[PDB]
């Protein structure tokens, strides 16, 4: 086994952890267990704390500093590693008891429990003209020594390591996404039936999505074009609520469906980040510093969820639109386009 | 200014059923980002182990890897007829990704002597313009040999290329093909050609000389 290690600027504190990515199984989150090595030679305050922080990092638009960022703590937890207060005695994990043995009594254990219905680590895509730190939701464990919780923490007597709350594809695949819609126009009782379905419910990052379309046009109108588009939804709930839909993959096929005739075709799209770099704010999976990460994985909420969950809640849907001729009695005033949507799960398979 | 991979062995020899270990030490700390590959002659390499210790799907359970600072090791509990091939250690933390030199694994056998035979140059070759004598060795182990030509009781050097075939799958033996390339004029003059071999199976250097 191997553990991650990071020391403070002057080397008096050193944080140890078994892993960076702590999986969220919906029903439980992997606990953040580790130790903090502090030599007595440098321990003068005689109080070492460890803190887990889930904060949303953002930039203010009015301010033109070019890189300035701010944090807003969504969830924060505290564990007094030293001195061990008599009203807190916890059993060390296998991981922890291996570490003390290796290092010694100067390595004080800490263990945090991430509660359910908290956001996963999601970083919003920065533009090319963005030099600050990564914006979005990110988890951070910060160890420091201070006389009390009131005192101001010195950056040299402290060390911060970034960690990620992640999720993976369900082991059981969900039901095949299928959706239908029928539009009836006033000119006559002839309907325009649109039927669409995806190949599977779960899709891994960078995999092809096949859309089986079947249009049955009995109307006097003609389908000029067919626009398929994989769209990324992102519900952001911090101070009031924002949301957006953005096409990460699309295709504008000029397949015509003449009046009183059927049509059937399979379209294949594949979302990838290269042809989406210019989309500032596009949700991406959590970044430790500034590496390239894939498109944000769909976040899985509980069934009987609490709702109004903080952070960023990303989803995906495939929209199948039909651009219809319009005209006639009403002219081009009334819209005749018919569209239907198909939700699907996009995320990484569980690593073994 | 790049991270190189050095496999500690050069050529490993072991019998069927042995526990073989190949060590490979990287230039600097590449973390647990190391892999191992197997290459049969004339074939492409096959991935054996990744992430230093994690085994790849479809690879037998006998193979296993382990990390130790900068030293990464490949191990096999019991050695099978399918495992006799060359091996390579890789790193893939930083680019460029580099490979090791290679370890020649081979089947162990009783030290047999080579069936040395000497072949004169054909009539079709001397009429063309060149001359090439061939001293052939066949069926022997180990593959380490040091053959040297002698023409007119004198050690000739600077014109003797050698070629060694791979170990056979059934009987597990080697063979060697040394060719003394020379011009047609040198063949007629001082015609006392011979080749002298030296092997472990042979207690003394046996010589095969031909005239006419």
């Amino acid at each position: 086994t191997r553990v991650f290690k990071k020391a403070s600027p002057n080397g008096k504190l050193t944080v140890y952890l078994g892993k960076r990515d702590f999986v969220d199984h919906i029903d439980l989150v992997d606990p953040v267990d580790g130790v903090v090595l502090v030599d007595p030679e440098y321990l003068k305050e005689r109080r070492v704390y460890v803190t887990l922080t889930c904060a949303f990092r953002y930039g203010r638009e009015d301010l033109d500093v070019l890189g300035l960022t701010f944090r807003k703590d969504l969830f924060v937890a505290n564990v007094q590693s030293f001195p061990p207060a008599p009203e807190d005695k916890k059993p060390l994990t296998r991981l922890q008891e291996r570490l003390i043995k290796k290092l010694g009594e100067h390595a004080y254990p800490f263990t945090f429990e991430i509660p359910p219905n908290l956001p996963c680590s999601v970083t919003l895509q920065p533009g090319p003209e963005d030099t600050g730190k990564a914006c979005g939701v990110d988890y951070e464990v910060k160890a420091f020594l201070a006389e009390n919780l009131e005192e101001k923490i010195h950056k040299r007597n402290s060390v911060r390591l970034v960690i990620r709350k992640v999720q993976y594809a369900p082991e059981r695949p969900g039901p095949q996404p299928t959706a239908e819609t029928t539009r009836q126009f006033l000119m006559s009782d002839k309907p325009l039936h649109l039927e669409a379905s995806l190949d599977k419910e779960i899709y891994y990052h960078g995999e092809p999505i096949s859309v089986n379309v079947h249009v049955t046009n009995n109307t006097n109108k003609t389908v000029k074009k067919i626009k398929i588009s994989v769209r990324q939804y992102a519900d952001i709930v911090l101070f009031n609520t924002a949301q957006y839909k953005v096409p990460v993959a699309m295709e504008e096929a000029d397949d015509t469906v003449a009046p009183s005739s059927t049509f059937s075709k399979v379209y294949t799209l594949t979302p990838f980040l290269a042809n989406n770099r210019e989309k500032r704010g596009l949700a991406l999976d959590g970044k430790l510093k500034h590496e390239d990460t894939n498109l944000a994985s769909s976040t899985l909420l509980r069934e009987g969820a609490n709702r109004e969950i903080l952070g960023i809640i990303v989803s995906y849907k495939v929209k199948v639109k039909l651009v219809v001729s319009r005209g006639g009695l009403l002219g081009d005033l009334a819209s005749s386009d018919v569209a239907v949507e198909l939700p699907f799960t996009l995320m990484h398979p569980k690593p073994k | 200014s790049d991270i190189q991979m050095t496999q500690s062995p050069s050529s490993l020899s072991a019998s069927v059923g042995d526990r073989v270990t190949i060590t490979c030490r990287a230039s600097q700390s590449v973390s647990s980002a190391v892999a191992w590959y197997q290459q049969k002659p004339g074939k492409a390499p096959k991935l054996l182990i990744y992430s230093a210790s994690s085994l790849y799907s479809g690879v037998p359970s006998r193979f296993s890897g382990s990390r130790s600072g900068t030293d990464f090791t490949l191990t096999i509990s019991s050695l099978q007829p399918e495992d006799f091939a060359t091996y390579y250690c890789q790193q893939y933390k930083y680019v460029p990704v580099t490979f090791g030199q290679g370890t020649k694994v081979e089947i162990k056998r009783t030290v047999a002597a080579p069936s040395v035979f000497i072949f004169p140059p054909s009539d079709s070759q001397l009429k063309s313009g060149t001359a090439s004598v061939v001293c052939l060795l066949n069926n022997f182990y180990p593959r380490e040999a040091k053959v040297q030509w002698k023409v007119d009781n004198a050690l000739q050097s600077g014109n003797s290329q050698e070629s060694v075939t791979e170990q056979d799958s059934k009987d597990s033996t080697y063979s060697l093909s040394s060719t003394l390339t020379l011009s047609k004029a040198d063949y007629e003059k001082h015609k006392v050609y011979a080749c002298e071999v030296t092997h472990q199976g042979l207690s003394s250097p046996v010589t095969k000389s031909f005239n006419r």
């Binding site: 553990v3 991650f4 290690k5 | 973390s31």
Partner: peptide, 4 residues
Amino acid sequence: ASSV
């Protein structure tokens, strides 16, 4: 950075 990591350590055994």
